Each structure stands twice: as structure tokens, then as C-alpha cells.
């Protein structure tokens, strides 16, 4: 899925129907920005539950 020679660790899958106030491009941007945050990155690496 990634053309880069960087290995994949995390997968984010956000699928759904068309609903008001739901922009899936913006939802993916929010998920990616959260993944890029330092504290959430470390916490996701050390997470053992949801």
C-alpha cells in the first residue's frame, strides 16, 4: 500500500456512509494528525487496550 521503503506499523481504517457533518477526508486528516502527535504516538506504541 505504501510505495516508500518505510515499514508499516499502524493501520487506520475509517469507512462509513454519507452522513451530515462527516467529511471522510477531514476525518482521515484528524486521525493522521492525532497519529502525528508525540504523546498519542508514544501512547499508541505502548497501548495494551482501547
Amino acid at each position: 500500500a505504501v510505495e516508500l521503503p518505510v515499514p508499516i506499523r499502524f493501520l487506520f481504517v475509517l469507512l462509513g456512509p454519507e452522513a451530515p457533518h462527516i467529511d471522510y477526508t477531514q476525518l482521515g486528516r484528524a486521525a493522521a494528525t492525532l497519529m502525528s502527535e508525540r504523546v498519542f504516538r508514544i501512547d499508541a506504541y505502548m497501548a495494551q487496550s482501547r
Binding site: 508525540r38 504523546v39 508514544i42 506504541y45 505502548m46
Partner: protein, 293 residues
């Protein structure tokens, strides 16, 4: 492994007490190369199972070191002692615990091997098993009266050696046994100090989940957060701050976890510790084990 040649030589007054330059009897050579028929024939006719040279290595030492279970299972009933120390004080159970030879260790323990036998620097087989990350070996030793709270000459516990290398499953076994999480060395280093020093964030999380002192100080006043900042581990710095680390406590040397970051020029550690630290040449190193056989 020429049994007939060995028998013919022995009938003509071949001396098994002859030793090589390394210090090996013919029983040593059989134990090194796994020749169980030769070792059986030598031990049958006047062979000392606990013969050693200048290094103090016995045939049991070289059988365990080369992982010859059949030689180990043959030397033990005939006199191969589990309590034979090498030059560095290592027993045959020291070598098995380091090399993850569980079946050899069970035979060594069954014939009276001691899991708390100490090297010249206070290192036990539990120290070597925990440092090498052998969870099954540690559990075996801990069921044979191994002391998980015992420290070496520098006070390092098996949990300290787990912290240096970073094996979560071994620390799980040790903590379930009853090992003190906040054990201190001679200079006051806790396993949280060592895990933060060596960049093992998974064990830092494990230790903090088991009530480790995030603001513990050594005799020189160094926090687990000064070790992470001194060694440049930005993610340990983040995880320690989020678990209650203080960015303003100072050490006896007069440094704060940030001044140290600025001193060795760690931009990432300085950037994170700069946000949490308010406005206002000695390096701390945990003790280590230099033992090797």
C-alpha cells in the same frame, strides 16, 4: 570418539592426568566434542570428574558450554560436581543459565546445583538468565530457591539487569515472584533509572505500571528523567513526564534534567523539556556487570 583406540591406549598405560596447554584432560576433550562413549570408558577406568586447570574449568564446565546433554547426564551421577567454580567463580549452572540450556539446568539442579551461587563479582545464574532474557530459565531457577532480590557487588539485582537490556517477559516473572520494584544499587539507581538510561521504554512503562518511583533520586540526586535526558531518549522523556516526573528537581551536581539536554545538545529532548521546565560537567552512569567467561 575412537573408543577402541582409547581402550587400547589406556591398556598400555596412557595417562589421563595429562593436560593440554589450555588445561584439558582427555575427559575434557570428550566433554567438549560430545563423545559419550569415550567419556563413559574414561570415567570407567580412573578419571577424575572434577579435574581442572589454571582456569578452573571442569569437564562439566566444557560439557555445559558446548551443550552436550549426554555428557552432562553422564558426568553428574559419577561425580561431576555442580558446585565447581571457574576462575571467575562461575559454576556449571552459571553457563547453562546464560545459554538458555533449560534441560541441562534441570539436570544440574536435580544433582544439587545452587541458583544463588555467586561469581567473583556477586553474579548468580539468575543474574545471567535475567540479563539474557530467558523467562523460562528464570522461572526454573526461581522455583529452586533463587533470590530475586540478591544484588551483585555493585548492588545490581536481576531486575536491574533486565532494565539494562529490556526484556518485558522476564520482568513479568520477577515481579510476580515478589521482587522489589524499587531496589537500589550502591549509588542509588533503581531499575527505572536503568531502563530510562538505556532507552527501554517498554520496561519503563512496565515498571511504572507496577508502582515504580518516577521521581526517585540517586545519592547524587539524579532522577530517572535526568538519565533519559542525558542519553537523549526523547520518548522516555515524554513518557516519564506524563507519569509524574518533575522537570525542576535538581541534582547534587547542580544540573536540572534540561540543562543536561542543552549541555550535550539534544535538540529533541531540549524542545520537549523546554515546554515543561520553568525559567531559572558530570555524567551519571549506572553500575554495570563486566563479568564474562
Amino acid at each position: 570418539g575412537h573408543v577402541e583406540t582409547v581402550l587400547a591406549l589406556l591398556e598400555k598405560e596412557a595417562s589421563q592426568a595429562c593436560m593440554t596447554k589450555k588445561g584439558f584432560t582427555p575427559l575434557h576433550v570428550a566433554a567438549k566434542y560430545g563423545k559419550v562413549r569415550v567419556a563413559e570408558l574414561l570415567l570407567e577406568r580412573d578419571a577424575h570428574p572434577n579435574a581442572a586447570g589454571k582456569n578452573g574449568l571442569t569437564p562439566l564446565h566444557v560439557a555445559v558450554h558446548h551443550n552436550n546433554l549426554d555428557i552432562v547426564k553422564l558426568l553428574l551421577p559419577r561425580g561431576g560436581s555442580p558446585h565447581s567454580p571457574a576462575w571467575n567463580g562461575y559454576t556449571p549452572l552459571h553457563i547453562a543459565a546464560k545459554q538458555n540450556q533449560v534441560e541441562v539446568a534441570r539436570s544440574l539442579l536435580q544433582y544439587g546445583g545452587s541458583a544463588n551461587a555467586e561469581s567473583v563479582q556477586g553474579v548468580t545464574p539468575l543474574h545471567l538468565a535475567a540479563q539474557e532474557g530467558h523467562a523460562e530459565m528464570v522461572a526454573l531457577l526461581l522455583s529452586k530457591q533463587a533470590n530475586g532480590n540478591l544484588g551483585n557487588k555493585s548492588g545490581l539485582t536481576p531486575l536491574h539487569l533486565v532494565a539494562q537490556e529490556g526484556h518485558v517477559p522476564v520482568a513479568d516473572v520477577l515481579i510476580k515472584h515478589g521482587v522489589m520494584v524499587d531496589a537500589t544499587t550502591r549509588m542509588g539507581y533503581t531499575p527505572l533509572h536503568v531502563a530510562s538510561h538505556y532507552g527501554n521504554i517498554k520496561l519503563v512503562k512496565f515498571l511504572l505500571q507496577h508502582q515504580a518511583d518516577v521521581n526517585a533520586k540517586t545519592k547524587l540526586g539524579y532522577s530517572p528523567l535526568h538519565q533519559a535526558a542525558q542519553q537523549g531518549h526523547t520518548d522516555i522523556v515524554t513518557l516519564l513526564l506524563k507519569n509524574g516526573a518533575s522537570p525542576n528537581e535538581v541534582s547534587s551536581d547542580g544540573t536540572t534534567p534540561l540543562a543536561i539536554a542543552k549541555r550535550l545538545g539534544y535538540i529533541s529532548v531540549t524542545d520537549v523539556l523546554k515546554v515543561v521546565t520553568d525559567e531559572t560537567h558530570r555524567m551519571s552512569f549506572p553500575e554495570t556487570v563486566d563479568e564474562i567467561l
